[PDB]
């Protein structure tokens, strides 16, 4: 128990890239194969200083159409202290990658990567609320239920030293 | 009592945005007791740069007492002062942010700017020998930055909160 | 509560465009101690060269070691186990420029820093991917650097020492151009 400190959370900013390391993949996976929809949370991060506050979540064992077979990957908007200064709904392109942990000087790494434009009609990409059906419900998270198969996750070095890296790159436009 | 700061407080890039919440309360406290002045966190203009601190009068100060918002910025003793030019001489631009969605319409912020005064004491190099008058120093600012009334219009206040933007024109970088 | 968490701060220790500036305060006293304990080494905070890059640390012997012992300030840098090592190219190959900063106002003066730069030699183990603890363990992380960075005599000149502190800058050259 300790106050404001853990305003480190406000110190978490990107590039606008977050790389999120999930350690204990062995224990976590089984723990999630044990209990359905056990969900891993990334630290919250700001797309950019005074920007949108997002967070990534992973289902190591899958969720929905990917339960028990796939890694499921989503992102979500969180209420951030500068929302009123930002355009809404959130509309930046988002790229997820599961990282191939290989030395880029032995063999070029093959990351597992998908990108999307958010859809304006997803309630979670409009301003932190504003009640808009918080009891819809469905995933408070937009993303891929079949991001990578438990089969494919074991190839190459997507898992290494018992950890995966999740990258989420938010396209940071500037050209008016 | 282990605060252990931090110091990792750095403008981006040159920009500090300062959020005052609990705005209603804080004001009703102002007219209840001048001269009171709330402070922004200390912040380095840039990594290894100048330490500054913004302060406000909710309030109003001197010229602005009772009637306006007054805002000032102060130079503070900084760990990298010996490596920097004195007196502090980077353009500083104040803004009170118009919290309207900047996508469907352009916000209109109120902006005052200045090049710091070489005569102005506070901008002199800190830690000369001070005692004991001094602390004195002593923000340069605007007593009538924006009044009551002409605030309240537009979204200069929203959700019981206002944003103070202090932008410092940073030392540029040399040569390709 | 403990409950550090100081380690959450270390992780936010990141070079500014590849640069660490390390301030060594209490230089008189520290120098004094190094004269009485030759193996006494000062250590910068660890720092990432770039956000998800390499974790390094600069270190210094104020009264010298090896060939500079007693006569010079000696200056080194080492590679530390880093959260992101598996994503990196090994061995560390980035160019490093050490400077001892001349603490003069750059407005009139134009400071004259003392500077040395080196390219990590791949034939040393020092810059190989660190062991996951272990491989090896000892203290591990043996640094590369300069036993004779700057003479005691030269450090007394200009403002290399000022207000009982010295500044060490380590600039790591990032490939950047992609």
Identify the closest residue of chain B to C161 by CA–CA distance: B82
CB neighbourhood size of A95 (10 A): 15
Q: Which chains touch A (3 or more CB pairs under 8 A)?
A: B, C
- CA angle at B149 for the pair B144 and B151, rounded to the nearest 5°: 70
Rounded CA separation A60/A32 (Å): 7
Tell me which residue in C12, C87, C90 faces A101 most closely, judged by beta carbons. Answer: C87
* Residue C103 near residue C156 (C-beta atoms within 8 A): no
Strands (E), chain C: 19-24, 42-43, 47-48, 55-61, 72-80, 96-100, 114-118, 144-151, 166-172
Non-local (6+) Cβ contacts of B107 within 8 A are B97, B98, B99, B100, B155
- Assess B7–C contact: CB distance below 8 Å, yes or no: no
Rounded CA separation C49/C120 (Å): 14
List beta partners, residue C78. C57
Tell me which residue in B8, B15, B99 faces A85 most closely, judged by beta carbons. Answer: B99
Contact at CB, A101 and C83, closer than 8 angstroms: no
Phi, psi of A159 (to 5 degrees): -110, 125
List beta partners, residue A94. A116, A170
Instruction: Kindly state the tokens that stand for C137.
Output: 């363990």
Torsion of Cα atoms, A89 then A92 then A97 then A103, to 10°: -150
Rounded CA separation C178/C166 (Å): 36
Rounded CA separation A159/A21 (Å): 11
Bond preceding residue A146 cis, omega within 30 of 0: no
Instruction: Give the determination technique.
Output: X-ray
CB neighbourhood size of C67 (10 A): 11
* Residue A169 near residue A97 (C-beta atoms within 8 A): yes
Tell me which residue in A2, A21, A160 faces C83 most closely, judged by beta carbons. Answer: A21
Strands (E), chain B: 15-20, 38-39, 43-44, 51-57, 68-75, 92-96, 110-114, 140-147, 162-168
> Which residues in chain B are contacts of A49 at CB distance < 8 A?
12, 15
Instruction: Kindly state the tokens that stand for A71.
Output: 């890694």
Identify the closest residue of chain A to B9 by CA–CA distance: A11
Domain B1-176 listed as CATH 3.40.50.10860: no
The residue behind tokens 């940073």 is B170
Phi, psi of A62 (to 5 degrees): 95, 170
Contact at CB, B86 and C103, closer than 8 angstroms: no
List beta partners, residue B114. B92
User: Among A106, A115, A114, which Cα is nearest to A157's?
Assistant: A106
CA distance B46 to chain C (A): 9
User: Among A126, A92, A173, A88, which Cα is nearest to B104's?
Assistant: A88
Rounded CA separation C118/A99 (Å): 32
Rounded CA separation C49/C78 (Å): 12
**A 30-49 → B contacts, CB under 8 A:** 48-49
Rounded CA separation C55/A47 (Å): 24
Tell me which residue in A11, A85, A88 faces B163 most closely, judged by beta carbons. Answer: A85
Could you say which of 1.10.460.10, 2.60.210.10, 3.30.43.10, 3.40.50.150 is the CATH number of the domain covering C1-178?
A: 2.60.210.10
Domain boundaries, chain C: 1-178
If you ran DSSP here, which 8-state letter would residue B64 be given?
A: G
* Residue A101 near residue A158 (C-beta atoms within 8 A): yes
Rounded CA separation C173/C57 (Å): 15
CB neighbourhood size of C74 (10 A): 24
């Amino acid at each position: 128990q300790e106050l404001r400190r853990e305003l480190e959370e406000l110190s978490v900013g990107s590039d606008g890239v977050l790389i999120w390391k999930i350690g204990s993949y062995g224990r976590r996976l089984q723990e999630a194969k044990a209990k359905p929809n056990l969900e891993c949370f990334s630290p919250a991060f700001y797309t950019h200083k005074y920007g949108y506050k997002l967070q990534v979540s992973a289902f190591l064992n899958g969720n929905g159409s990917g339960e028990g077979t796939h890694l499921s990957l989503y992102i979500r908007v969180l209420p951030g202290a500068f929302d009123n200064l930002l355009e809404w709904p959130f509309a930046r392109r988002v790229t997820f990658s599961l990282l191939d942990q290989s030395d880029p000087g032995l063999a070029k790494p093959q990351h597992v990567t998908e990108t999307f434009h958010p859809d304006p009609n997803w309630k979670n990409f409009q301003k932190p609320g504003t009640w808009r059906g918080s009891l819809d419900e469905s995933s408070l998270g937009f993303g891929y239920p079949k991001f990578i198969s438990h089969q494919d996750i074991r190839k190459r070095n997507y898992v290494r030293d018992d950890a995966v890296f999740i990258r989420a790159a938010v396209e940071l436009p500037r050209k008016i």
